[model samples]
Target: MAHHHHHHMFLDDVNVFLDDLNTNPITDEWYMSNFADKHIKILESYEAFDILKQFVDYMIEEHDEKSEYEIMEILRQLKYQADTNEKFYTNTQKQKIVELYKQEISQDILNEIFR
Candidate 1:
C-alpha cells in the first residue's frame, strides 16, 4: 500500500543524504571551527539506521501480525543498503554499522539472507 512507500522513500532520502555527506568536503570556516559538529553529523546518520530498526520492530509488534517472511524481507533490504553504502563510511563508522547489524541479525542468518 501507499503507506509502506513512505518508509522506502524515507530510507532512500537518508541514503542520498549520506552519499552527499560522503562525497562533499566540508569547507565552511565556521563549520570547521567545531570538529565535534562534524562528528555529530556522522553519528546522526548512524542513528538514522536505528530509527529504521525501531520502525521495523513496531511493524512486527503492532501490525501485519508479525509475519516472519515480511520481517526478514525488510531486514534483508536494510542489510543490502548497509553493505552497498559502507564504502562511503569511515572505518569507525563502518565498524559501528557492522556492529549494529550484528546486534539485530546473526551473521549466519545474514549469510543465508544474502544467499
Candidate 2:
C-alpha cells in the first residue's frame, strides 16, 4: 500500500500565495549569474510579452530589451525550488513552467539550427 502526499493532504487548507515579490531587476544573485553586470534601474514604459509577467511577476522587459536579470530571477527561483525540494510533486509546478519555456526556446533553437 502506498499513499501520495498530495492525495493525503487534499485541500486540507487553502493558502493564498503572494505574487508581489520585491525583486530587483538588477543586483540580485540571479542577475549576476545569468546576465552580465549591466542592470536596469527602472522598468520604464516597456511593452512586455504575455508570458513575461507569468514568468517574472513584477518586472517588465519590453520589446528589444536586453535585460536578462528579471527573467533570470524567475528561472533562479524555479530552479531553486526544483533543486531544493525533495519530492517531485512539490516541484511539479516549476517543472511545468520550465516545460513551457522549453517549448518556446526549442522553436528559437530550431530556427538557429535549421537556418
lDDT of the candidates, in the order given: 0.38, 0.31
What is the per-residue lDDT of model 2 for residues 71-100, given as tens digits with 9 covering 90 to 100? 444333333323322112222233333332
- Candidate 1 accuracy as TM-score: 0.30
Alpha-carbon RMSD, each predicted model: 17.5, 16.3
In candidate 2, what residue range of length 10 has the lowest lDDT sum? 12-21
Worst 10 residues of 1 by lDDT: 27-36
Candidate 1: tens digits of C-alpha lDDT, residues 33-89: 232223222324445456445534443333332233333434444444444232223
Q: Model 1, 27: alpha-carbon shift in Å?
A: 51
lDDT of 1 at 45: 42
How many clashes does the backbone of model 1 have? 0
- The whole-model C-alpha lDDT of candidate 1 against the native structure comes to 0.38
Which segments of candidate 2 are over 4 A away from where they belong? Answer: 1-53, 56-61, 84-115
